Each structure stands twice: as C-alpha cells, then as structure tokens.
Amino acid sequence: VVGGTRAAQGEFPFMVRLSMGCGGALYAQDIVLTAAHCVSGSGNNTSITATGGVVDLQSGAAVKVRSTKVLQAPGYNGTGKDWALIKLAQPINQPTLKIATTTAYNQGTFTVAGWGANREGGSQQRYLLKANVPFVSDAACRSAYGNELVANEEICAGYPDTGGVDTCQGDSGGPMFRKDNADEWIQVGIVSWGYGCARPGYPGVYTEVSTFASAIASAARTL
C-alpha cells in the first residue's frame, strides 16, 4: 500500500498473508478468498501457508495454517475473473468478511489493506498498512486503460488526478471493503492489477466481487 498508514492489531482481523506474497480475506474460518493470479491453478495443494491474526508478520502471536486445496476461477486466463478460494487445513479463529452480493455498495470511499510495497518496486512490509481510496467509474477508468478493462468484472479506485495512494505489488488478492448499511464491513473488491502504483491517471483495478458472488458462494460449498 502506497500512501498508507499502520492498521492497528485487531482492526481488520479477517486479513491473512499468503506465502506466495499475496493478501487474502477470511471468507469462512477455513476458506481464504484471494486473487486467481496468486495461484497456479486448482486442485489439492498443501504448499501454501496463510498467516492470520496479526498485523505484525514477525509476531509470535501469528497463526500459520497450511492449505489443502485451491479453487481458481474457472476459465481464468489473465483477463477478468480474478478470484480464487484457498481451503485451509484448520480454521483461523477470527471474524470473517462478508462479500457484496449486490452492487449497492460499489461506490464511495473504500479501504484497502496489505503487506505489499509502499512504493514501485519497493519491498514487502512487516506490518499491515491501510489506506482509503475512492471509487472510479468504469468510464473514467476506461479512459485510462482502454480495452484492457473488463467493466463488468472490474471496479477501479484511487485518485485519477494525483495518484499518491494505491495498492502495489504484494497487495494482490487482498480485500477492498467498506461499511454496509448495518455498519458492518463488506467486501466489494479483490486487489487485481494496475499500471505502476499511485501514478496520476492510472487507478488501481480490482475484481468486482458482486459479479462473482454467486459463483464464489457455490464453489465455497464444494470445498
């Protein structure tokens, strides 16, 4: 996260750090929702580690659990459909994060969090950083990315005018969230891609969770 600040221990307890260098959110206590590009494909896999319960990755309080299976979005090919579920060997006993099933919240100011670089080509962070980034319409985002944007599957956020605050390398797979009408956190995006980090005219692109909600809920049931 570029232009970020330290999140407090316990602020976003649903966050997990994945061993390949991606963030994730606890969809279920033993199911991590992350990006498709963080994994190589679906199947049994006990090679991933999820670190949950701490803002400080070096914390002795860290909970580290191994995966058992991975379900990448069917047909992922690098264009859209940027989501995957990771089944854990054991539950991480922390609050989960609800996902958006409608588009009612795909607007306003979102919060992003991660242990990714705080600058282009910078290094991974020890402590979880957070930032607020505003929604950018598909049209304004398209004015920047052209045909690379899959409007129905992607939601943009950031400051088109000045840049300055954004997600960056290593933040991928992390949730982009905000409060719902019940003042509960709700997941509207997955960190997916962008050109550079925090540059004027290039907002961050995120998986538009509302589009894939049903697909995700169903896959989660079979895991």
Ligand SMILES: [Ca+2]
């Ligand atoms: Ca969109």
